[PDB]
Amino acid sequence: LATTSDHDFSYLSFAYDATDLELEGSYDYVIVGGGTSGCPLAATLSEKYKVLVLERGSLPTAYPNVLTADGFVYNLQQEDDGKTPVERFVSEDGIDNVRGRVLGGTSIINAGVYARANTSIYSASGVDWDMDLVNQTYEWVEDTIVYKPNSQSWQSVTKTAFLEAGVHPNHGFSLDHEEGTRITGSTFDNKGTRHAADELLNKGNSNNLRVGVHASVEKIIFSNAPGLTATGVIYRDSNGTPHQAFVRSKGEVIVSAGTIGTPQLLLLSGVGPESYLSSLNIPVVLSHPYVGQFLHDNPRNFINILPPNPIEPTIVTVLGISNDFYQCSFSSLPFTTPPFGFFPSSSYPLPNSTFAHFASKVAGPLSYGSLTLKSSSNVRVSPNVKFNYYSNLTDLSHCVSGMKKIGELLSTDALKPYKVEDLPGVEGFNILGIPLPKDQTDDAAFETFCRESVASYWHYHGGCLVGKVLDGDFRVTGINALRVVDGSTFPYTPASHPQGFYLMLGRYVGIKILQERSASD
Ligand SMILES: Cc1cc2nc3c(=O)[nH]c(=O)nc-3n(C[C@H](O)[C@H](O)[C@H](O)COP(=O)(O)OP(=O)(O)OC[C@H]3O[C@@H](n4cnc5c(N)ncnc54)[C@H](O)[C@@H]3O)c2cc1C
Ligand SMILES: *[C@@H]1O[C@H](CO)[C@@H](O[C@@H]2O[C@H](CO)[C@@H](O[C@H]3O[C@H](CO)[C@@H](O)[C@H](O)[C@@H]3O)[C@H](O)[C@H]2NC(C)=O)[C@H](O)[C@H]1NC(C)=O
Ligand SMILES: *[C@@H]1O[C@H](CO)[C@@H](O[C@@H]2O[C@H](CO)[C@@H](O)[C@H](O)[C@H]2NC(C)=O)[C@H](O[C@@H]2O[C@@H](C)[C@@H](O)[C@@H](O)[C@@H]2O)[C@H]1NC(C)=O
Ligand SMILES: *[C@@H]1O[C@H](CO)[C@@H](O)[C@H](O)[C@H]1NC(C)=O
Numbered sequence: 076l077a078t079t080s081d082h083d084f085s086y087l088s089f090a091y092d093a094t095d096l097e098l099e100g101s102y103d104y105v106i107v108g109g110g111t112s113g114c115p116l117a118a119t120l121s122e123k124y125k126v127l128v129l130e131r132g133s134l135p136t137a138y139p140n141v142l143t144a145d146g147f148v149y150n151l152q153q154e155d156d157g158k159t160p161v162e163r164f165v166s167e168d169g170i171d172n173v174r175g176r177v178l179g180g181t182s183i184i185n186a187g188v189y190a191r192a193n194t195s196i197y198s199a200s201g202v203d204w205d206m207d208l209v210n211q212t213y214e215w216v217e218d219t220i221v222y223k224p225n226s227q228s229w230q231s232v233t234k235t236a237f238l239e240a241g242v243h244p245n246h247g248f249s250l251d252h253e254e255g256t257r258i259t260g261s262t263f264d265n266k267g268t269r270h271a272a273d274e275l276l277n278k279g280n281s282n283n284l285r286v287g288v289h290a291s292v293e294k295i296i297f298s299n300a301p302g303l304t305a306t307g308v309i310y311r312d313s314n315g316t317p318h319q320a321f322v323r324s325k326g327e328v329i330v331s332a333g334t335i336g337t338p339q340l341l342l343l344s345g346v347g348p349e350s351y352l353s354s355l356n357i358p359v360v361l362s363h364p365y366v367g368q369f370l371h372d373n374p375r376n377f378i379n380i381l382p383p384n385p386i387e388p389t390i391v392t393v394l395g396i397s398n399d400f401y402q403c404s405f406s407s408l409p410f411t412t413p414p415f416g417f418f419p420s421s422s423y424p425l426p427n428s429t430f431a432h433f434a435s436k437v438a439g440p441l442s443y444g445s446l447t448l449k450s451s452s453n454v455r456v457s458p459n460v461k462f463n464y465y466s467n468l469t470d471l472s473h474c475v476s477g478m479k480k481i482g483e484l485l486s487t488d489a490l491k492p493y494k495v496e497d498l499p500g501v502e503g504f505n506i507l508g509i510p511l512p513k514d515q516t517d518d519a520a521f522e523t524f525c526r527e528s529v530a531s532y533w534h535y536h537g538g539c540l541v542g543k544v545l546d547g548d549f550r551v552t553g554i555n556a557l558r559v560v561d562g563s564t565f566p567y568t569p570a571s572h573p574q575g576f577y578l579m580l581g582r583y584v585g586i587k588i589l590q591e592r593s594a595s596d
């Protein structure tokens with residue numbers, strides 16, 4: 076783990092605005108998306124080769140509130156002017172959501188919860204994992220931006236509630252995703268300073284790594300030398316001037332534009348379903364039926380309580396893990412401006428006092444949808460995405476069990492002091508929004524609750540799966556010098572909170588590439 080310190084912006088020495096980058100550059104590797112996986116990947120590759128990372132968003136310094144824990148809600152509340160770090164979108168299901176648009180990616184605007192992936196998921200994932208390397212990489216990330224949190228009153232209350240409610244065993248402080256209750260790590264340090272993926276750029280070689288911000292990558296360039304190969308990308312700066320960045324022999328273009336951005340860029344570049352691309356007059360580079368398919372978004376269901384006695388805002392650190400659902404509680408100050416994506420719609424009552432948000436994330440999820448373009452030419456126009464929440468009934472069953480567990484928490488001695496009236500069961504609380512069914516044994520009522528109150532846990536992933544679009548080495552099948560490394564590569568969430576795994580993934584693949592270049596050297 077790391078030690079509390081200011082956000083490290085040393086990498087600014089090699090950060091440039093796209094308008095200042097050359098019109099035509101040559102590198103060993105070009106990384107699209109300076110996000111959660113993108114930054115550590117770029118830093119690792121720069122240890123030996125010339126790397127250029129292209130990020131559409133601004134430097135974190137352009138939006139100071141992304142650098143503190145008490146700025147979390149603020150960023151979500153900010154109006155989307157097309158340049159802000161929080162990009163708003165609404166799935167076809169009608170659920171509000173957001174994604175990062177800034178150097179550091181979504182790790183720069185998230186809730187800071189850090190967890191290592193469930194150790195049992197690597198086995199039949201389609202990737203032959205080097206577990207020694209996986210752990211060395213987690214350590215590499217953790218020693219740079221992960222911290223053991225301060226004790227916090229509300230989180231402690233939540234911990235007592237989980238333990239009283241049978242979420243066992245107790246793991247004390249642990250980073251591992253395991254069944255039971257525990258206090259995990261956070262990317263927010265003990266002074267509330269947010270640390271993120273961008274700082275992993277500092278681990279790279281300052282003479283080999285170059286970062287371009289305000290760089291909108293619109294298309295991947297291909298050629299046959301002699302086989303189909305990615306040769307670079309076209310990106311545009313704030314002046315509307317297009318640039319080109321090419322990769323040299325043995326080099327590669329790696330797309331780390333995220334669950335939403337990666338499939339979008341591939342489609343715009345002619346890599347996707349042939350009939351679909353043709354319907355939009357997009358030249359087909361390679362028919363790839365699964366690009367944009369298998370998009371998953373774990374549903375979030377919750378209960379907001381308004382204690383009669385004020386509680387203090389806290390960062391989530393206490394996790395109550397079950398096999399089918401993951402839970403936690405977020406305490407916060409009241410708002411009069413809605414944080415987009417926090418509640419499912421803009422028409423949700425706002426809290427005028429301090430409140431606690433008990434959240435439940437369904438594992439998986441088994442349900443999935445797809446991503447389609449909204450513009451056949453403009454990469455700045457958000458793609459259409461549908462997740463089909465609860466289309467798979469097993470997900471619904473898990474939501475029911477999960478909300479019943481929340482009901483248990485609400486019925487504990489631990490939460491009694493936060494009720495307005497001493498009533499039986501889950502009754503007695505001042506609830507903001509949709510309350511739980513009073514009868515904890517009414518499954519049908521819980522199913523309706525699950526469906527009508529659903530929101531996004533913001534941990535969407537998939538869209539460019541290993542075994543569907545990519546091979547075990549994250550290469551886009553059928554195309555040379557092209558890989559994908561970010562949250563779009565797997566169908567299910569790796570843990571209650573995925574940033575740890577995606578951060579690790581970036582460097583992991585980076586190391587695999589260096590090992591590959593060593594053997595072929
Ligand atoms: C509100 C919120 C709270 C969250 N809280 C937590 C939490 O507490 N703990 C946790 O573990 N996880 C959390 N997550 C999820 C986690 O942050 C994400 O799963 C993770 O950051 C995704 O990593 P990524 O590398 O795939 O994508 P991203 O980090 O999003 O990175 C993709 C990058 O590509 C850029 N990009 C996209 N298209 C282009 C293009 N065409 N050209 C150039 N650049 C482009 C984007 O701007 C972005 O910087 C949260 C997510 C949200 C939205
Ligand atoms: C990669 O890291 C894994 C953790 O992220 C690690 O698994 C953990 O390994 C430790 C021992 O190194 C196990 O032991 C701990 O827990 C047991 C049971 O509770 C205690 O008896 C021990 O005293 C100790 O506290 C962990 O249980 C285990 N955790 C998990 C979730 O599996 C892997 O072994 C590492 N892999 C490699 C190849 O290094
Ligand atoms: C909901 O997700 C389940 C797990 O992915 C699906 O079941 C699985 O379906 C596989 C076929 O794609 C099959 O090989 C697995 O054995 C099976 N596993 C389980 C838990 O049964 C389920 O699909 C439906 O049920 C299975 C059993 C088959 O009959 C499928 O044809 C059904 O579609 C998913 N349900 C939905 C709504 O898709
Ligand atoms: C860990 O992953 C395995 C394999 O996918 C799964 O069976 C198990 O339920 C998961 N455990 C938890 C607590 O999520």
Ligand SMILES: N#C[C@H](O)c1ccccc1
Nearest residue numbers: 223224225226247248258
């Ligand atoms: N469990 C436990 C430890 O006391 C603990 C560890 C980290 C932060 C708060 C508290």
Ligand SMILES: N#C[C@H](O)c1ccccc1
Nearest residue numbers: 196197200565566567569
């Ligand atoms: N189970 C499961 C997920 O698909 C998964 C996620 C990351 C790595 C391996 C597997």
Ligand SMILES: O=Cc1ccccc1
Nearest residue numbers: 186188391403405434
């Ligand atoms: O899982 C973390 C979290 C944080 C704030 C609101 C909901 C969930």
